[PDB]
Amino acid sequence: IIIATKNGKVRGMNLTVFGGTVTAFLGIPYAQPPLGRLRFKKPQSLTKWSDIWNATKYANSCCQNIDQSFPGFHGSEMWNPNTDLSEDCLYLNVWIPAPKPKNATVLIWIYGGGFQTGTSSLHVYDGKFLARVERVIVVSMNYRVGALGFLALPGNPEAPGNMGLFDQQLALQWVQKNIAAFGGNPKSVTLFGESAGAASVSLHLLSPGSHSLFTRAILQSGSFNAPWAVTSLYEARNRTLNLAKLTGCSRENETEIIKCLRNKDPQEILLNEAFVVPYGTPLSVNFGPTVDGDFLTDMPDILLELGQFKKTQILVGVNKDEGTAFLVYGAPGFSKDNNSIITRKEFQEGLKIFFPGVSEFGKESILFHYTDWVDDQRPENYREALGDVVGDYNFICPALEFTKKFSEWGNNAFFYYFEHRSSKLPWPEWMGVMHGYEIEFVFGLPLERRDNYTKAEEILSRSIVKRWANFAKYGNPNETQNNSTSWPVFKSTEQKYLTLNTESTRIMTKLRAQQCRFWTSFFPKV
Amino acid sequence: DIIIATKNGKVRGMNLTVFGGTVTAFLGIPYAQPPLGRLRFKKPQSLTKWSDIWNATKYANSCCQNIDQSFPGFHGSEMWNPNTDLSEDCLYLNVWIPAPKPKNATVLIWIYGGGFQTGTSSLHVYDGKFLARVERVIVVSMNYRVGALGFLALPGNPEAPGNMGLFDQQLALQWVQKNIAAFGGNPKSVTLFGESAGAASVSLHLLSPGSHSLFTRAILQSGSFNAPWAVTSLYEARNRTLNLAKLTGCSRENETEIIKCLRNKDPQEILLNEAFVVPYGTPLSVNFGPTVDGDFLTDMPDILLELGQFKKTQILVGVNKDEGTAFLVYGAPGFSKDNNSIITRKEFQEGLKIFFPGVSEFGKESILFHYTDWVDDQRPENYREALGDVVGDYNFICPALEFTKKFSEWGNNAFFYYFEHRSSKLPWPEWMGVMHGYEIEFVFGLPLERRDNYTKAEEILSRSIVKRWANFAKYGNPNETQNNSTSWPVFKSTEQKYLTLNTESTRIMTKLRAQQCRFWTSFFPKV
Numbered sequence A: 001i002i003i004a005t006k007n008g009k010v011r012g013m014n015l016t017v018f019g020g021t022v023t024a025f026l027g028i029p030y031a032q033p034p035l036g037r038l039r040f041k042k043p044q045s046l047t048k049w050s051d052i053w054n055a056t057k058y059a060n061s062c063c064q065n066i067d068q069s070f071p072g073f074h075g076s077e078m079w080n081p082n083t084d085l086s087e088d089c090l091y092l093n094v095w096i097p098a099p100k101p102k103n104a105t106v107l108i109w110i111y112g113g114g115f116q117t118g119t120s121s122l123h124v125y126d127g128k129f130l131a132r133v134e135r136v137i138v139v140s141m142n143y144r145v146g147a148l149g150f151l152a153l154p155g156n157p158e159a160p161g162n163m164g165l166f167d168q169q170l171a172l173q174w175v176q177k178n179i180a181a182f183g184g185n186p187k188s189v190t191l192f193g194e195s196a197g198a199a200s201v202s203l204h205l206l207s208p209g210s211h212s213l214f215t216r217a218i219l220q221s222g223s224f225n226a227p228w229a230v231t232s233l234y235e236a237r238n239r240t241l242n243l244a245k246l247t248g249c250s251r252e253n254e255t256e257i258i259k260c261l262r263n264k265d266p267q268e269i270l271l272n273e274a275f276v277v278p279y280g281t282p283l284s285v286n287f288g289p290t291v292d293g294d295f296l297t298d299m300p301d302i303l304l305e306l307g308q309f310k311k312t313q314i315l316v317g318v319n320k321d322e323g324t325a326f327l328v329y330g331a332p333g334f335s336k337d338n339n340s341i342i343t344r345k346e347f348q349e350g351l352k353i354f355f356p357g358v359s360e361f362g363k364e365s366i367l368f369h370y371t372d373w374v375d376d377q378r379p380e381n382y383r384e385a386l387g388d389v390v391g392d393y394n395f396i397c398p399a400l401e402f403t404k405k406f407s408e409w410g411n412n413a414f415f416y417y418f419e420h421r422s423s424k425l426p427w428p429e430w431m432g433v434m435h436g437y438e439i440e441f442v443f444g445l446p447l448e449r450r451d452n453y454t455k456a457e458e459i460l461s462r463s464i465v466k467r468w469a470n471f472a473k474y475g476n477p478n479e480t481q482n483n484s485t486s487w488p489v490f491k492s493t494e495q496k497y498l499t500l501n502t503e504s505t506r507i508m509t510k511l512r513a514q515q516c517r518f519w520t521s522f523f524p525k526v
Numbered sequence B: 001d002i003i004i005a006t007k008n009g010k011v012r013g014m015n016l017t018v019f020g021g022t023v024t025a026f027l028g029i030p031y032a033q034p035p036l037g038r039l040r041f042k043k044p045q046s047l048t049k050w051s052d053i054w055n056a057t058k059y060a061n062s063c064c065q066n067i068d069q070s071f072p073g074f075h076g077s078e079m080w081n082p083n084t085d086l087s088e089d090c091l092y093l094n095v096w097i098p099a100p101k102p103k104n105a106t107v108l109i110w111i112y113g114g115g116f117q118t119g120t121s122s123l124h125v126y127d128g129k130f131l132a133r134v135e136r137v138i139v140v141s142m143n144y145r146v147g148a149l150g151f152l153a154l155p156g157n158p159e160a161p162g163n164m165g166l167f168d169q170q171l172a173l174q175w176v177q178k179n180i181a182a183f184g185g186n187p188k189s190v191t192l193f194g195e196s197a198g199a200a201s202v203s204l205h206l207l208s209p210g211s212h213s214l215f216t217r218a219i220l221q222s223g224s225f226n227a228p229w230a231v232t233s234l235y236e237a238r239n240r241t242l243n244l245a246k247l248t249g250c251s252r253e254n255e256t257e258i259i260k261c262l263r264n265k266d267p268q269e270i271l272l273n274e275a276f277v278v279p280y281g282t283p284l285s286v287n288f289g290p291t292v293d294g295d296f297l298t299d300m301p302d303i304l305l306e307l308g309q310f311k312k313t314q315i316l317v318g319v320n321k322d323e324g325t326a327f328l329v330y331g332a333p334g335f336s337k338d339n340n341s342i343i344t345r346k347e348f349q350e351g352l353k354i355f356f357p358g359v360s361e362f363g364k365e366s367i368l369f370h371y372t373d374w375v376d377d378q379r380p381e382n383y384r385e386a387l388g389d390v391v392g393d394y395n396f397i398c399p400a401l402e403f404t405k406k407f408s409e410w411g412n413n414a415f416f417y418y419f420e421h422r423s424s425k426l427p428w429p430e431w432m433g434v435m436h437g438y439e440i441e442f443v444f445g446l447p448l449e450r451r452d453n454y455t456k457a458e459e460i461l462s463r464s465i466v467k468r469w470a471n472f473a474k475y476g477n478p479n480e481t482q483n484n485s486t487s488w489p490v491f492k493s494t495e496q497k498y499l500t501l502n503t504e505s506t507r508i509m510t511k512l513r514a515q516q517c518r519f520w521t522s523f524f525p526k527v
């Protein structure tokens, strides 16, 4: 099973999926290995190769810190890379239906991981199911994360910032030149991702270099206007200079700072990333997107406000409990091993950790806005409020606020609210419907009748997978089945959204309006 | 002849014809020695005896006060101006008795408001002839000293100890205990009621050990001591006294010389300077009012309330829907009683600086945030309505609710109302809605008089409010009838049930303006 790309032939492998067949091509190189003189630089286009590339196993994951807070725990370890770490990691994967399609829609997955972690080869990103059930072509790339991906000495081509974003954009460029040879339609390409993946997709709506490289966009639990997504030039420069200091690379001029950084072992870079931001949070993104004047021609909120971005259709959404995952990474009183019932004071300590630079009036005003209890007897009040504080501020409110502005320029927007907690979720019950745990439903893992999961979870995933594909193909996440539930456009006034769960999905309006009003209209003044 | 022998002497009254019946009115009975000369600023002194028969057939002098003159000829403002001669010789009370004479009637004692600076018992809206006719209760009202003459304070000093006006109220209560039986009254069934500063006063008699045996129960209309305007700290009070002395050229070595000089000033000279003892006042500013004097009030009232140190009895408490609107035409930019007063966001913010002079920019910004979650925009009247609600909630509604809640935690029955009817004869514009003080005419039964141009529906409402007040006074339960009547449940800190009062339908609701009051009790203080 061989395909001639513009750079050479690639051998693939036949997968047997659900009685049918899917053809997979794992680890196709799409850029030159960013090594030596090439570390910190934008990805260089690839040159032809003589023999045949065996695209039969996942490639190296990009250099990154590993989450080892809970050794042996499936809930944390499932996000860690499952192939070797290496700077030689610029590769992508293509999944294709059998029999081979003629002009198939392409879905391109961009993984999350706070711009510091992530890899395309995770089991929860296996695109074979989508290829089988909806007969789309699925692509996913590895892009550089952390300092190696986002170190910025702004204005300097030797370390310009947003290198990982250019990686993704180069992978998109690859699809355009090569996907017809796989039976895909370059003219029908939908970007989707989650967390930093979603913020990445949203930045691709803004970058002129990405304008001609895709068609529609799906944003799961993330957008560029989230408070963690984009770092200012001053902060990015400070962080870079802190890293130079931490690694013994503090130099007189920038060209020498970089020479020295190019000579550090990857691990001396990785293990120093944690120290560059003086009072980080469990949500702190050490090295991420910045305004480089290249990929991002200007500050994002301004571009969006002014109206210069790709005019197309989007599908945006969030999980019910986006904030709970981060509480066990340093909020006092919390633990994945107990119920984590906290007190008013532990809650105030929590705010301190999640809101380090904020005045006492500001924190006090957050406490006030999230303490108007329905039942004042309820002992889990503070635990839930802190989770909501962190979810609304970091994910939910940015996502709604993005969708309002985007739709205000006459674009079809569809908003979802994912409310189902997987019966397999390794994290304890109080954590609810966690950040990241809708992904396996999108990628159709519960369609596998040997995979554990409930029947209802198979049906739920069946329709999500159907709407995602139909949104990709058609620009409307419509479902079949004369029952269905009819998904309506998102508008600044009514703000209609669809809920997703196993016991009846319904159309609601103004998601968390009372909470979000605080974050968009008051908090920026404290 | 109509003649009652009292401890102080015989008193002659007059018959009034009310609703085809008769009420006997004794207007302007002295209950204390005239606080003149050396008695100025002192506590009231007991009345010995008057000579011959005192003719209580006309209302007495009202106490010295400044007059509202912002609107000449306008009934809306002028109905609160005193309607008898002004004088320092003003310590008199009024008694209305049903005819024929009761043997043991329940007594209602009215205490007027006017921000401790103004007011008089002789206003038409406090005529007690109706309540006496219809419910056969005895009605008493008294004049008490207001302003500097009433509340000049140098605590510890008997020449001007503070709270003299409150002690005037108290002495009148004492007079009722001593004398009401001769009028056919029951001194063991006495209910205090008042509005605004009158209600703050009533709430203060609940705290004052000297008042504890001079009444039975208490009704509080739009006011309580815990409202931001009600009580001055001990040294803010002294400060005001010292400043008044400076303004009038009475600043001296010692305190008794200061008072000595102030006793030689014309009342007008003192009265015209009251408004300058405070550097930055609001339309709701109480220049001279109640304070912690050590005699009447042994500690800050909030502390006494928290500690359960008050008279354990039943209370009836309530507020009007638009408490704050009245104050806006007296200072806030954009507002006018002859305009519909559509204001902008910037006008709103300027209004906030008027009503909250000393509050930080962030304090004001958060009041703004809390009051602008609009149901509908642009809807021009949003900001106008918002500012009225801010003023009303902060000064009247939220403290009244907080007071009832805290009072009921100590085990006595409390009943809360929300008065929502706008009088068909209200002279103020529509935008001011259900105003401060405009439930009073309904409580006193004025709409029962058919020759008066109220609607039938207003008569029915008033007849019902008159019955419930009178029932509360008599029984500690503001019932109307058993059968065909909406029951008024107790106010408990959990459910916080209250009764709405209007002409459409009266009903039981819960947690009045809980979301707004939550801001004023639990966030604003920290600001």
Ligand SMILES: *[C@@H]1O[C@H](CO)[C@@H](O[C@@H]2O[C@H](CO)[C@@H](O[C@@H]3O[C@H](CO)[C@@H](O)[C@H](O)[C@@H]3O)[C@H](O)[C@H]2NC(C)=O)[C@H](O)[C@H]1NC(C)=O
Pocket (backbone or CB within 6 Å): B471, B475, B477, B479, B480, B481, B482
């Ligand atoms: C409103 O509710 C109260 C109960 O809280 C009722 O109080 C009761 O009132 C009756 C008179 O209607 C009292 O009984 C009688 O009083 C008269 C003097 O008025 C006397 O002649 C009789 O010998 C007898 O004592 C009764 O003490 C009192 N009960 C209690 C425990 O308060 C009131 O009747 C209700 N009113 C209406 C119209 O619903």
Ligand SMILES: *[C@@H]1O[C@H](CO[C@H]2O[C@@H](C)[C@@H](O)[C@@H](O)[C@@H]2O)[C@@H](O[C@@H]2O[C@H](CO)[C@@H](O)[C@H](O)[C@H]2NC(C)=O)[C@H](O)[C@H]1NC(C)=O
Pocket (backbone or CB within 6 Å): A234, A235, A238, A239, A242, A243, A245, A246, A275, A276, A277, A278
């Ligand atoms: C820009 O950098 C400085 C220095 O940051 C230091 O922070 C340490 C945690 C460590 O990473 C080290 O390598 C790095 O150089 C930041 O200023 C510091 O702020 C703290 C108070 O939080 C002070 O105690 C320090 O005096 C001060 N820096 C020093 C070392 O003088 C600064 O905050 C940062 N700017 C931004 C954007 O936050």
Ligand SMILES: *[C@@H]1O[C@H](CO[C@H]2O[C@@H](C)[C@@H](O)[C@@H](O)[C@@H]2O)[C@@H](O[C@@H]2O[C@H](CO)[C@@H](O)[C@H](O)[C@H]2NC(C)=O)[C@H](O)[C@H]1NC(C)=O
Pocket (backbone or CB within 6 Å): A450, A451, A452
């Ligand atoms: C779905 O579950 C089955 C077994 O059911 C669970 O039993 C629990 C006590 C615990 O072992 C849990 O891990 C397990 O999921 C899984 O089958 C077993 O998987 C284990 C490895 O975890 C193998 O060692 C066993 O040989 C295997 N067989 C059994 C016991 O039936 C199965 O892997 C799982 N499926 C997925 C994809 O999650």
Ligand SMILES: *[C@@H]1O[C@H](CO[C@H]2O[C@@H](C)[C@@H](O)[C@@H](O)[C@@H]2O)[C@@H](O[C@@H]2O[C@H](CO)[C@@H](O)[C@H](O)[C@H]2NC(C)=O)[C@H](O)[C@H]1NC(C)=O
Pocket (backbone or CB within 6 Å): B001, B051, B052, B053, B054, B055
């Ligand atoms: C209170 O008023 C009376 C006069 O007014 C009343 O006189 C009653 C006898 C009775 O008829 C009643 O209806 C009427 O309103 C003053 O009367 C004094 O005594 C006689 C009786 O009229 C008069 O001729 C006197 O002029 C008058 N005395 C004086 C001082 O001249 C009574 O004095 C008065 N009391 C007070 C304290 O002023």
Ligand SMILES: *[C@@H]1O[C@H](CO[C@H]2O[C@@H](C)[C@@H](O)[C@@H](O)[C@@H]2O)[C@@H](O[C@@H]2O[C@H](CO)[C@@H](O)[C@H](O)[C@H]2NC(C)=O)[C@H](O)[C@H]1NC(C)=O
Pocket (backbone or CB within 6 Å): B235, B236, B239, B243, B244, B246, B247, B276, B277, B278, B279
């Ligand atoms: C008590 O109050 C005085 C206020 O001074 C007042 O003087 C009055 C005669 C009157 O004119 C009034 O308008 C004026 O405000 C406080 O005095 C402050 O500080 C000095 C005097 O020490 C004055 O020069 C200031 O003007 C005054 N403040 C302001 C802004 O007016 C005094 O501090 C205060 N003391 C206490 C214990 O409350």
Ligand SMILES: *[C@@H]1O[C@H](CO[C@H]2O[C@@H](C)[C@@H](O)[C@@H](O)[C@@H]2O)[C@@H](O[C@@H]2O[C@H](CO)[C@@H](O)[C@H](O)[C@H]2NC(C)=O)[C@H](O)[C@H]1NC(C)=O
Pocket (backbone or CB within 6 Å): B464, B484, B485, B486, B487, B503, B504, B505, B506
């Ligand atoms: C009994 O009287 C009612 C009115 O009495 C009402 O009083 C309120 C304070 C409250 O207690 C409420 O529960 C109670 O119903 C009479 O109803 C009235 O009838 C007239 C016509 O005759 C209507 O025009 C009024 O709107 C209406 N008043 C209301 C509902 O507020 C009614 O006559 C009588 N009902 C019965 C069943 O006998």
Ligand SMILES: *[C@H]1O[C@H](CO[C@H]2O[C@@H](C)[C@@H](O)[C@@H](O)[C@@H]2O)[C@@H](O[C@@H]2O[C@H](CO)[C@@H](O)[C@H](O)[C@H]2NC(C)=O)[C@H](O)[C@H]1NC(C)=O
Pocket (backbone or CB within 6 Å): A252, A253, A254, A255, A256
């Ligand atoms: C930025 O800095 C590098 C290195 O910094 C050098 O600065 C010199 C003035 C001196 O202090 C030296 O010790 C220090 O290392 C510059 O490279 C230098 O270039 C000069 C000639 O211009 C050589 O003589 C030095 O040997 C050389 N240093 C090394 C090790 O390369 C570089 O020129 C400068 N570039 C920019 C953009 O300013």
Ligand SMILES: *[C@@H]1O[C@H](CO)[C@@H](O[C@@H]2O[C@H](CO)[C@@H](O)[C@H](O)[C@H]2NC(C)=O)[C@H](O)[C@H]1NC(C)=O
Pocket (backbone or CB within 6 Å): B001, B002, B015, B022, B099, B100
């Ligand atoms: C004042 O009112 C009283 C009470 O209504 C009147 O006295 C009553 O008069 C009627 C008829 O003359 C008698 O039947 C009653 O018995 C009287 N009551 C008493 C206690 O005497 C009296 O007429 C009025 N006085 C006036 C008009 O000055």
Ligand SMILES: *[C@@H]1O[C@H](CO)[C@@H](O[C@@H]2O[C@H](CO)[C@@H](O)[C@H](O)[C@H]2NC(C)=O)[C@H](O)[C@H]1NC(C)=O
Pocket (backbone or CB within 6 Å): B103, B104, B186, B188, B189
């Ligand atoms: C008026 O009613 C009161 C009760 O409200 C009677 O006064 C006394 O009531 C106390 C309890 O508060 C009892 O201990 C006494 O027995 C009552 N006094 C007497 C002498 O019986 C009072 O009697 C009534 N006054 C009347 C009818 O003139």
Ligand SMILES: *[C@@H]1O[C@H](CO)[C@@H](O)[C@H](O)[C@H]1NC(C)=O
Pocket (backbone or CB within 6 Å): A001, A014, A015, A016, A021, A098
């Ligand atoms: C696997 O590969 C063959 C070619 O070697 C391809 O034609 C076919 O689609 C695949 N076979 C199946 C059905 O798995």
Ligand SMILES: *[C@@H]1O[C@H](CO)[C@@H](O)[C@H](O)[C@H]1NC(C)=O
Pocket (backbone or CB within 6 Å): A011, A052, A053, A054, A056
């Ligand atoms: C490619 O795959 C085939 C089949 O497994 C294998 O025989 C061959 O060695 C591989 N080629 C390379 C590049 O090693």
Ligand SMILES: *[C@@H]1O[C@H](CO)[C@@H](O)[C@H](O)[C@H]1NC(C)=O
Pocket (backbone or CB within 6 Å): A332, A333, A334, A335, A337, A338, A339, A340, A341
């Ligand atoms: C749960 O575990 C954490 C971490 O060990 C601990 O600090 C906390 O006190 C525990 N919570 C409860 C309910 O005891």
Ligand SMILES: *[C@H]1O[C@H](CO)[C@@H](O)[C@H](O)[C@H]1NC(C)=O
Pocket (backbone or CB within 6 Å): A102, A103, A185, A187, A188
């Ligand atoms: C895909 O088919 C051809 C390229 O094979 C292209 O001309 C056409 O416009 C595309 N459109 C679709 C969605 O069929």
Ligand SMILES: *[C@H]1O[C@H](CO)[C@@H](O)[C@H](O)[C@H]1NC(C)=O
Pocket (backbone or CB within 6 Å): A470, A474, A476, A478, A479, A480
């Ligand atoms: C949904 O898919 C596309 C939307 O444009 C269209 O071809 C199809 O008719 C639609 N079906 C339903 C049931 O909405």
Ligand SMILES: *[C@H]1O[C@H](CO)[C@@H](O)[C@H](O)[C@H]1NC(C)=O
Pocket (backbone or CB within 6 Å): B334, B335, B336, B338, B339, B340, B341, B342
């Ligand atoms: C009416 O109120 C006063 C009239 O003197 C004025 O200052 C205000 O601007 C007017 N309001 C409006 C614009 O209706």
Ligand SMILES: [Cl-]
Pocket (backbone or CB within 6 Å): A227, A228, A229, A230, A231, A284, A285, A286, A288
């Ligand atoms: Cl960040």
